[PDB]
């Protein structure tokens, strides 16, 4: 006769991940590589969003 013993599942061998990246990144260069920095009496807060 013929019998159902087990079922094979062909498990995956690797992981693929693909995501979107915006061309503009951030003005950290305008902050860390800035030519001039503010006095400790008038601190420079720049908003990043």
């Amino acid at each position: 006769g013929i019998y159902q013993t087990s079922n094979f599942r062909v498990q995956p061998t690797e992981s693929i991940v693909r995501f979107p990246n915006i061309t503009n990144l951030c003005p950290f260069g305008e902050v860390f590589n800035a030519t001039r920095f503010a006095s400790v009496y008038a601190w420079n807060r720049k908003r990043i969003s």
Epitope: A38, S39, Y41, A42, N44
Partner: nanobody, 115 residues
Framework: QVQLQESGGGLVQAGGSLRLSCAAS????????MGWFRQALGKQREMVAV???????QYANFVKGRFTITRDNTKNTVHLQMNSLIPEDTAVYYC?????????WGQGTQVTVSS
């Protein structure tokens, strides 16, 4: 890039008169406050005078009744009529834009008075 143009100093005999000028460029948002400061070689920044957008003028006791600040609203510039000169006024002066964000300084104007 906020820039302050300072001009009008030099060598003047005792009793003469000069007219310094700072023009402000860049952002310089409307509620601004600008002063002039003094520094002689070996001393600190001495607050000479200050003017705000309110048109009020504040002067120190060092130069009582001698130096004046004049405002130009059209170009938003300032001129300091510096008269009745005395050797104790021998110091390089600098510009101070309070504004609302960081305060930008000038490059300097040499003022010498001696005989």
């Amino acid at each position: 890039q906020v820039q302050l143009q300072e001009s009008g100093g030099g060598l003047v005999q005792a009793g003469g008169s000069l007219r310094l000028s700072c023009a402000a460029s860049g952002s310089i948002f409307s509620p601004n406050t600008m002063g002039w400061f003094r520094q002689a070689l070996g001393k600190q920044r001495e607050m000479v005078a200050v003017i705000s957008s309110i048109a009020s003028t504040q002067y120190a006791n060092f130069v009582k009744g001698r130096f004046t600040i004049t405002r130009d609203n059209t170009k938003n510039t300032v001129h300091l009529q510096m008269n009745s000169l005395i050797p104790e006024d021998t110091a390089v002066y600098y510009c101070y834009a309070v504004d609302k964000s960081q305060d930008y300084w000038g490059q300097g104007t040499q003022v010498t008075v001696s005989s």
